[PDB]
Each structure stands twice: as C-alpha cells, then as structure tokens.
Coordinates of C-alpha atoms and ligand atoms in Angstrom, one line a residue:
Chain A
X536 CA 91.5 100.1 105.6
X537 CA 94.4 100.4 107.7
X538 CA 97.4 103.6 107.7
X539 CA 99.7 104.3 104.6
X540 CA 103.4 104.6 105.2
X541 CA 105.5 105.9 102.4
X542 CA 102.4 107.9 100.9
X543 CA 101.0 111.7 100.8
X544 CA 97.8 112.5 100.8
X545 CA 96.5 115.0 97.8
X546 CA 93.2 117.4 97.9
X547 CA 92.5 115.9 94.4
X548 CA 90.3 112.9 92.3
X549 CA 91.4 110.6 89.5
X550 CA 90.0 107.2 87.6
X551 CA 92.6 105.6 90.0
X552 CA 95.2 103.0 89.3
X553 CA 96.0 100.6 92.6
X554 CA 93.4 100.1 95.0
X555 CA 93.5 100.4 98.5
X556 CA 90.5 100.5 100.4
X557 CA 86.9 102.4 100.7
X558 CA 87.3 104.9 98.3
X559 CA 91.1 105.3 98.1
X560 CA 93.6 104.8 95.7
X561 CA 96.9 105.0 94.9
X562 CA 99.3 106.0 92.0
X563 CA 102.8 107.2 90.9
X564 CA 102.6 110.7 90.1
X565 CA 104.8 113.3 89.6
X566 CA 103.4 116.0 91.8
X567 CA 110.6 115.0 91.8
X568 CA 108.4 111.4 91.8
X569 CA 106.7 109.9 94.6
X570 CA 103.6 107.5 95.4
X571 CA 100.3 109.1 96.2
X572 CA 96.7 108.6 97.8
X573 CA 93.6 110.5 96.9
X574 CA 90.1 109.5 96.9
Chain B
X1392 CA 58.3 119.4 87.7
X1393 CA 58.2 115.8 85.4
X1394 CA 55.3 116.3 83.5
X1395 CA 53.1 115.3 87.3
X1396 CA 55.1 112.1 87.6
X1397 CA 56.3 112.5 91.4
X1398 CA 60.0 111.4 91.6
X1399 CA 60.8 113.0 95.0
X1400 CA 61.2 110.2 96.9
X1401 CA 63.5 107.8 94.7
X1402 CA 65.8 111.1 94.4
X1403 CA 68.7 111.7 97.1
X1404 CA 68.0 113.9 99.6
X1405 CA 70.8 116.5 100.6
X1406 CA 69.8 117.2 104.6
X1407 CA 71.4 114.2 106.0
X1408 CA 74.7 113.5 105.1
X1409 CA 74.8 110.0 103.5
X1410 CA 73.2 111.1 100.2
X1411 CA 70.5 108.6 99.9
X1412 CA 67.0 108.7 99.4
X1413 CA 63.7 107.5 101.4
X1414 CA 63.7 104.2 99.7
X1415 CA 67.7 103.2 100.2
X1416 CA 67.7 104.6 104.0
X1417 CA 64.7 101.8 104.1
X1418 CA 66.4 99.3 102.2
X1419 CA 70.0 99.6 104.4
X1420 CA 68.2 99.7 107.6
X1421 CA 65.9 96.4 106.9
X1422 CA 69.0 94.6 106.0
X1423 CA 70.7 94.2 109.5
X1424 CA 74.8 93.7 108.8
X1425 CA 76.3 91.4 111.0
X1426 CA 79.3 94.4 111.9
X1427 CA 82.5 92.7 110.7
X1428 CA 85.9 93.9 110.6
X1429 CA 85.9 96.5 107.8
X1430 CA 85.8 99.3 110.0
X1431 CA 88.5 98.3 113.0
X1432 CA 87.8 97.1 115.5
X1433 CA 90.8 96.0 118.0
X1434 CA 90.5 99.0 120.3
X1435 CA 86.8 98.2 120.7
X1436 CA 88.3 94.3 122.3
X1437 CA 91.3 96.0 123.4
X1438 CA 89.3 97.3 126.4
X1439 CA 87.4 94.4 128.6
X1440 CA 83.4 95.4 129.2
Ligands
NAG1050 C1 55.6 113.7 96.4 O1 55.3 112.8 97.4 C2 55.7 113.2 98.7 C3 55.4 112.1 99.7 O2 54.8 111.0 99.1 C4 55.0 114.5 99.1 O3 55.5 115.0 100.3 C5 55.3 115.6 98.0 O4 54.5 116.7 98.2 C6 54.9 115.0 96.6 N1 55.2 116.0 95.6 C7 54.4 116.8 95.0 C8 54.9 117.7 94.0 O5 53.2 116.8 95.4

C-alpha cells in the first residue's frame, strides 16, 4: 500500500487493530512503547 | 477418503504458490481485472515506451 515511516516490522500475527493495506496492520504494542506492523 | 465422494478438486492445492484450487484458478482467470492502481504503478509511467 505504500512505505511505513515511524514503524517496525515484527515476525509475528494478531486479530489486528488499525488497518493499513493487503494484509497489514498496525498496533501500539509494547514489544519501552512503540507502533508496530505485522501481517 | 470421503466415503467415495471426490473432493480433490474444490480443495487447495499446495504446488503452486497462491493456495487455490482448480475451480478458483478458473474463476480468477475468466474474470479479466482491468489492472488499477493497487499494486504501484508510477515507475511503470515513469519510463516512456
Ligand atoms: C478426483 O478427480 C480427479 C480429476 O477429476 C482425478 O484425477 C482423481 O483421481 C479423482 N480422485 C480419485 C480418488 O479417483
């Protein structure tokens, strides 16, 4: 859908809570706090 | 085995990699898409040919 700035990408899956794009969400988790993506 | 009912052909098949089955590989390519901008696209028109 496009490129995320401010982001990380994780090697993990969960019933996601913002949408992005085809198959990725995002979410404010905790692994300090930070936003990430994951499919 | 399903009792002799043969169900092989509505269930995925894992060689390709897109795990769908006989009948939704012939469903998506009868349905032409008219290849919009959900995949980008501007290097493609970025380039004059
Ligand atoms: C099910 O049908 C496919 C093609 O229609 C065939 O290749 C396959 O052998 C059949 N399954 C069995 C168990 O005969």
């Amino acid at each position: 859908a496009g490129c995320l700035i401010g982001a990380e990408y994780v090697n993990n899956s969960y019933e996601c809570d913002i949408p992005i794009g085809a198959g990725i969400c995002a979410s404010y988790q905790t692994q300090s706090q930070s936003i990430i993506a994951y499919t | 085995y399903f009792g002799g009912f043969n169900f092989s052909q509505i269930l995925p098949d894992p060689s390709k990699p897109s795990k769908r089955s006989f009948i939704e590989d012939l469903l998506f390519n009868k349905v032409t898409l008219a290849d919009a901008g959900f995949i980008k696209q501007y290097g493609d028109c970025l380039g004059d040919i």
